PDB file of C-alpha atoms and ligand atoms in Angstrom:
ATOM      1  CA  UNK A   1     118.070  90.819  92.981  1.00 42.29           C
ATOM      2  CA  UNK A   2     115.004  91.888  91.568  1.00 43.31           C
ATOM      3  CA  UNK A   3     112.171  93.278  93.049  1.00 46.36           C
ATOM      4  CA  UNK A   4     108.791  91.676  92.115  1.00 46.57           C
ATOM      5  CA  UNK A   5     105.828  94.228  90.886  1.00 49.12           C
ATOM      6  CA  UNK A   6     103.682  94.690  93.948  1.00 49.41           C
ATOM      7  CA  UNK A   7     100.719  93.028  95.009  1.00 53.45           C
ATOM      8  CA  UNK A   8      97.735  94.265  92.586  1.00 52.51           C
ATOM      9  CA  UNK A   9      95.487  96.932  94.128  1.00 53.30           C
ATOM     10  CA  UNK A  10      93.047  97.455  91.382  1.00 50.36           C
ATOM     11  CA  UNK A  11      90.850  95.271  89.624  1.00 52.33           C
ATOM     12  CA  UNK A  12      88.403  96.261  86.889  1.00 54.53           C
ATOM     13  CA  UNK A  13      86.495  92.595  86.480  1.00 54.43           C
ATOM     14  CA  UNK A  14      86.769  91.927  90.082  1.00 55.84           C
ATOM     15  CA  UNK A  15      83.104  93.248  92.200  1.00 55.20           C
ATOM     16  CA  UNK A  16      83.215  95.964  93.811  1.00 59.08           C
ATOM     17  CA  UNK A  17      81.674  96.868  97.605  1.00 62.97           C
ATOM     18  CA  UNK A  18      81.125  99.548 100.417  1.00 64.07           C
ATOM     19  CA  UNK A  19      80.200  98.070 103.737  1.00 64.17           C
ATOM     20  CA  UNK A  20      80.863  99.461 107.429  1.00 60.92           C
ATOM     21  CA  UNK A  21      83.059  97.037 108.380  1.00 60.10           C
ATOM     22  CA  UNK A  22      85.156  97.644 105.239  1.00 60.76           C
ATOM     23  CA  UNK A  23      84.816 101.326 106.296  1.00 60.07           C
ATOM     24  CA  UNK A  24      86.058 101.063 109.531  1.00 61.73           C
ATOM     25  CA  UNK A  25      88.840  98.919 108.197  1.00 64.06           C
ATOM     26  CA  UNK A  26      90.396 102.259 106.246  1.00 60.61           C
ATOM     27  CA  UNK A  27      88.897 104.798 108.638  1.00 57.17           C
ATOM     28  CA  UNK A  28      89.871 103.194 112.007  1.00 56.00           C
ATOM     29  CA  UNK A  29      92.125  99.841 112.317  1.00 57.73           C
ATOM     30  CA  UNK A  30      94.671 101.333 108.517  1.00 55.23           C
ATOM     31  CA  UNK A  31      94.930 105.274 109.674  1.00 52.44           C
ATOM     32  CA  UNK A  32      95.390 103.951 113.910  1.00 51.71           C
ATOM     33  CA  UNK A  33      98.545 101.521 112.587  1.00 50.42           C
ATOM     34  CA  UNK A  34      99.803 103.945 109.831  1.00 53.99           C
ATOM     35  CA  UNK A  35     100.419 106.400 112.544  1.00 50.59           C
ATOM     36  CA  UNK A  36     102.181 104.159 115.107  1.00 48.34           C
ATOM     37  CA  UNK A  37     106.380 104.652 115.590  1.00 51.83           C
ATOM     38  CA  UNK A  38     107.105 101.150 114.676  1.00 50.80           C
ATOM     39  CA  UNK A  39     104.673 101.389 111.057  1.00 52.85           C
ATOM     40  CA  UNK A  40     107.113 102.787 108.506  1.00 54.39           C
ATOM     41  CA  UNK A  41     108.718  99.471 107.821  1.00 53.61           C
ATOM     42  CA  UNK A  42     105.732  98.105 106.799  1.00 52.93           C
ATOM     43  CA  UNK A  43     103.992 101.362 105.155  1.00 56.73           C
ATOM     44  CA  UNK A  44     106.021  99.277 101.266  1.00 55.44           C
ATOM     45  CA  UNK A  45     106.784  96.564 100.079  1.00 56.95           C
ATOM     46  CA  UNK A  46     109.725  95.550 101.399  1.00 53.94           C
ATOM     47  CA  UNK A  47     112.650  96.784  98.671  1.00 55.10           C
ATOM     48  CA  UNK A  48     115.077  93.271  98.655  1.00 55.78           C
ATOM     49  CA  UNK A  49     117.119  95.097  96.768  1.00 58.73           C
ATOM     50  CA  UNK A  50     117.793  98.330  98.555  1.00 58.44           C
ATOM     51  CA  UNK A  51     117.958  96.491 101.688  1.00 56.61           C
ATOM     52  CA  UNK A  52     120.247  93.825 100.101  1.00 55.04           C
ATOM     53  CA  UNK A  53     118.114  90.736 101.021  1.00 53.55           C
ATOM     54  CA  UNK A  54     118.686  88.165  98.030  1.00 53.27           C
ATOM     55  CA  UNK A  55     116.721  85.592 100.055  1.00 55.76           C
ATOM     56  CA  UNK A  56     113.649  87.635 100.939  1.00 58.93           C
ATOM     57  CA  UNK A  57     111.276  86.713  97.903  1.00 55.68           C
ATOM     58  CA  UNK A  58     112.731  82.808  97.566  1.00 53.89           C
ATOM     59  CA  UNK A  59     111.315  82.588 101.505  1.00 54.91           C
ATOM     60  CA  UNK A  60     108.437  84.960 100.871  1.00 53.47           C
ATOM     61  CA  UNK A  61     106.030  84.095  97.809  1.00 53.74           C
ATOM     62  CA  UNK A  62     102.726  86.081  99.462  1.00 53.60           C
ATOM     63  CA  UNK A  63     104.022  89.457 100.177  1.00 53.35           C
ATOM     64  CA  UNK A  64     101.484  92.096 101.520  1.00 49.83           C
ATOM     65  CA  UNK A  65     102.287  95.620 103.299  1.00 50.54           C
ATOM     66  CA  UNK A  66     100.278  98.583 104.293  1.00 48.63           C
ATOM     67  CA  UNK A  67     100.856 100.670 101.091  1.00 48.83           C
ATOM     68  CA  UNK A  68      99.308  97.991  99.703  1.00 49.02           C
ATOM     69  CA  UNK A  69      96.217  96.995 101.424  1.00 52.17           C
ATOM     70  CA  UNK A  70      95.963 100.968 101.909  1.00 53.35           C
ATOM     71  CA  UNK A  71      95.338 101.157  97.959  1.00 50.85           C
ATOM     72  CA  UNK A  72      93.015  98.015  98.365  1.00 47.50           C
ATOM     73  CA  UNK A  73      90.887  99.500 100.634  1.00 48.08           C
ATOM     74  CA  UNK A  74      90.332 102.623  98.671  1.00 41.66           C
ATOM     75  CA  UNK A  75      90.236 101.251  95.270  1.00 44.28           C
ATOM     76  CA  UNK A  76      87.065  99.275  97.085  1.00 44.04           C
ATOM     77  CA  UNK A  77      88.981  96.013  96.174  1.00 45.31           C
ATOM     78  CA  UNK A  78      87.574  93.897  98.510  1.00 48.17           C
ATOM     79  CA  UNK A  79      84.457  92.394  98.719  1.00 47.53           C
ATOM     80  CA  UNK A  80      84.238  91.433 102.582  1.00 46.77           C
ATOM     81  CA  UNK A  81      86.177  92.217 105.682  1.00 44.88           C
ATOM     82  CA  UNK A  82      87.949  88.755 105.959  1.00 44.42           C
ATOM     83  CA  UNK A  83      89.622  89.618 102.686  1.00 49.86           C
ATOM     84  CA  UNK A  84      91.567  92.623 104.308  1.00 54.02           C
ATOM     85  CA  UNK A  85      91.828  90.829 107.791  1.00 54.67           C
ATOM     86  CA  UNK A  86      93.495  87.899 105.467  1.00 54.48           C
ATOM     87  CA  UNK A  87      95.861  90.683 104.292  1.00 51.92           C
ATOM     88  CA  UNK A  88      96.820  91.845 106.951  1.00 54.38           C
ATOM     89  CA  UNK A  89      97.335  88.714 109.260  1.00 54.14           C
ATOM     90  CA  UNK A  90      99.426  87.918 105.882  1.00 55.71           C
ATOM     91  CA  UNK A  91     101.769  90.676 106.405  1.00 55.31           C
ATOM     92  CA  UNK A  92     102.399  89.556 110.291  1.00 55.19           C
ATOM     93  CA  UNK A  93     103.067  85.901 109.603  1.00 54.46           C
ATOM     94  CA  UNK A  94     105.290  87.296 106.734  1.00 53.68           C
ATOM     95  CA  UNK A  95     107.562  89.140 109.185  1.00 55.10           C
ATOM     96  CA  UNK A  96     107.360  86.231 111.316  1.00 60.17           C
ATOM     97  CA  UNK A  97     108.545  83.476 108.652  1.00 58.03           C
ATOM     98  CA  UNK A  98     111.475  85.690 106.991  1.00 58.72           C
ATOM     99  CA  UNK A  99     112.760  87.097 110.488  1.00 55.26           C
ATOM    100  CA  UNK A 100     114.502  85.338 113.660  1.00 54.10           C
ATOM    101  CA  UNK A 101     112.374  85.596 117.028  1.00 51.13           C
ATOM    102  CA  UNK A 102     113.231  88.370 118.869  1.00 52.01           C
ATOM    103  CA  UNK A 103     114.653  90.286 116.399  1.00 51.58           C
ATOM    104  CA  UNK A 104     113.504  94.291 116.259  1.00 50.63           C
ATOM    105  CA  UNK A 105     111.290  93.986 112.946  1.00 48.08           C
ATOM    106  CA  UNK A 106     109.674  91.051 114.903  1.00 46.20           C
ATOM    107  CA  UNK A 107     109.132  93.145 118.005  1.00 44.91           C
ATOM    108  CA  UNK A 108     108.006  96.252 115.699  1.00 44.02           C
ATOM    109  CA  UNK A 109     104.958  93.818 113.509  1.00 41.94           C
ATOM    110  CA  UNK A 110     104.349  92.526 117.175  1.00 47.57           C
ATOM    111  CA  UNK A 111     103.487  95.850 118.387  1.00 49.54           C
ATOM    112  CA  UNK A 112     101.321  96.366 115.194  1.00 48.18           C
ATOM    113  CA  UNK A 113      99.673  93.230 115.433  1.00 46.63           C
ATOM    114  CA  UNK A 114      98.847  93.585 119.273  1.00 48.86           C
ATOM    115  CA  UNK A 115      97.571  97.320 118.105  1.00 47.68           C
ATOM    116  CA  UNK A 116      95.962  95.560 115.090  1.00 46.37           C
ATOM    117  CA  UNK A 117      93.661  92.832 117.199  1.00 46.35           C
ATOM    118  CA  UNK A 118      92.456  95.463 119.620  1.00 46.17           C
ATOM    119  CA  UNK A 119      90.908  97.366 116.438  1.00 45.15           C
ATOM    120  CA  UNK A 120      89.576  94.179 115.013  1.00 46.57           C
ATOM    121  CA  UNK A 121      87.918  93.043 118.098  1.00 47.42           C
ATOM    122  CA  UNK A 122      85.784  96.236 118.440  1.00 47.92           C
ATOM    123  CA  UNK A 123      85.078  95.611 114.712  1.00 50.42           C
ATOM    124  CA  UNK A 124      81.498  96.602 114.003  1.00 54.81           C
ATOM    125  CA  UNK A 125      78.690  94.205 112.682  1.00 60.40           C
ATOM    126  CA  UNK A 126      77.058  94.426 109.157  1.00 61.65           C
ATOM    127  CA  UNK A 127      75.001  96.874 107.953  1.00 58.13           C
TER     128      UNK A 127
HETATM  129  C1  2TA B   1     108.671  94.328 106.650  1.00 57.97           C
HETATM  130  C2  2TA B   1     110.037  93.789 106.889  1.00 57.97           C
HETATM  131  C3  2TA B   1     110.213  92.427 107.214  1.00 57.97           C
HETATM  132  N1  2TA B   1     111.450  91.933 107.432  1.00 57.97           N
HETATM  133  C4  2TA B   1     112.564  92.698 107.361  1.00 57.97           C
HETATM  134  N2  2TA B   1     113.792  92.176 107.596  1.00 57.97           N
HETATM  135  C5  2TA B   1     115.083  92.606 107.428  1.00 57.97           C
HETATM  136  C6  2TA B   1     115.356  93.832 106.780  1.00 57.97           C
HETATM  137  C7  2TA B   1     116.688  94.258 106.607  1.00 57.97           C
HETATM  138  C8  2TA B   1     117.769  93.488 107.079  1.00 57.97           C
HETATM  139  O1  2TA B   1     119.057  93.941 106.895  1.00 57.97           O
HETATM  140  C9  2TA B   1     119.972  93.591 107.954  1.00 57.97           C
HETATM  141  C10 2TA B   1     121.193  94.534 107.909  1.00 57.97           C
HETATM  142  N3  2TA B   1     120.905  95.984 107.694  1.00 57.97           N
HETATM  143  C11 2TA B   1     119.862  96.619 108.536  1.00 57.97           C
HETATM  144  C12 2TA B   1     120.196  98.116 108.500  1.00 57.97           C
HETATM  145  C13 2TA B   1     121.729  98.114 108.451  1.00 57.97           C
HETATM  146  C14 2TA B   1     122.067  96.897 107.575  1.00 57.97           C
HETATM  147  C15 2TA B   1     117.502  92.264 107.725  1.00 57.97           C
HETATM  148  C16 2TA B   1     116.176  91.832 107.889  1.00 57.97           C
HETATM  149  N4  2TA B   1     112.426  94.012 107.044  1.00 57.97           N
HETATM  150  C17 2TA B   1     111.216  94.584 106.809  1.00 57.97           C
HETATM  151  N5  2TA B   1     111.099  95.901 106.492  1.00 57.97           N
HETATM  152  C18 2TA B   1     112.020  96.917 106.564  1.00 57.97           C
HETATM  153  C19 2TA B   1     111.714  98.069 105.802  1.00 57.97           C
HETATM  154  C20 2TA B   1     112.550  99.201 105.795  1.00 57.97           C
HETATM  155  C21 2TA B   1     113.730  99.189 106.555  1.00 57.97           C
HETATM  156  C22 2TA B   1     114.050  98.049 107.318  1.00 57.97           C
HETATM  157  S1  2TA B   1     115.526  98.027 108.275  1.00 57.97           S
HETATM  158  O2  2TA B   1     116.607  97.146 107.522  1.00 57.97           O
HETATM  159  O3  2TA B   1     116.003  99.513 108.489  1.00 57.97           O
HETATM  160  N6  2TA B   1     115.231  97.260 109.838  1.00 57.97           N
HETATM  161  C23 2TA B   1     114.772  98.044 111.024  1.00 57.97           C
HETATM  162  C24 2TA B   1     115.953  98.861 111.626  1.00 57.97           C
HETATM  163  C25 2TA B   1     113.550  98.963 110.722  1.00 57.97           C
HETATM  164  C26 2TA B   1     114.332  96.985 112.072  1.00 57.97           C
HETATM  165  C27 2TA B   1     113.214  96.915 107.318  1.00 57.97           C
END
């Protein structure tokens, strides 16, 4: 295959924002999943060709990982919350679409994603 470029992370013409939520969005619900066991395989985008998945971006045209909304976050790239939320929820479903139930890289984002909706719900309000 080839790989596609990654998801952009940086946007000069695009407004730019600092809110608590979006703080506690890199500070809290990023750094708690980064550091979980089952993280790593979602820390990248996923390499189709080093893993030898020809299919993988024919069955997946909005791909989103970690790295990614990692760089987002910092870069200030989004405006609100529900942008990153978006992002991530993206990468779950993703894993869920490509993937057959059950299998271990379903059972790994299902970790993540029970990890990530904890965070989320003690999400703090505005301002
Ligand atoms: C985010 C993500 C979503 N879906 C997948 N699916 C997937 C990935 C690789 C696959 O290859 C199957 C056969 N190989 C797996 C390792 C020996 C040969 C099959 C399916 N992988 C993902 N990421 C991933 C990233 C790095 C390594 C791997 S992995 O192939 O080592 N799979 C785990 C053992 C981590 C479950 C997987």
């Amino acid at each position: 295959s080839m790989n596609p470029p990654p998801p952009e992370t940086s946007n000069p013409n695009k407004p730019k924002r600092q809110t608590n939520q979006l703080q506690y969005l890199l500070r809290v619900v990023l750094k708690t999943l980064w550091k979980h066991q089952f993280a790593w395989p979602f820390q990248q985008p996923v390499d189709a060709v080093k893993l030898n998945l020809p299919d993988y971006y024919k069955i997946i045209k909005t791909p989103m990982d970690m790295g990614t909304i990692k760089k987002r976050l910092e870069n200030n790239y989004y405006w609100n919350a529900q942008e990153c939320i978006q992002d991530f929820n993206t990468m779950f479903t993703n894993c869920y679409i490509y993937n057959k139930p059950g299998d271990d890289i379903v059972l790994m984002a299902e970790a993540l994603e029970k990890l990530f909706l904890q965070k989320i719900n003690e999400l703090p309000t505005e301002e």
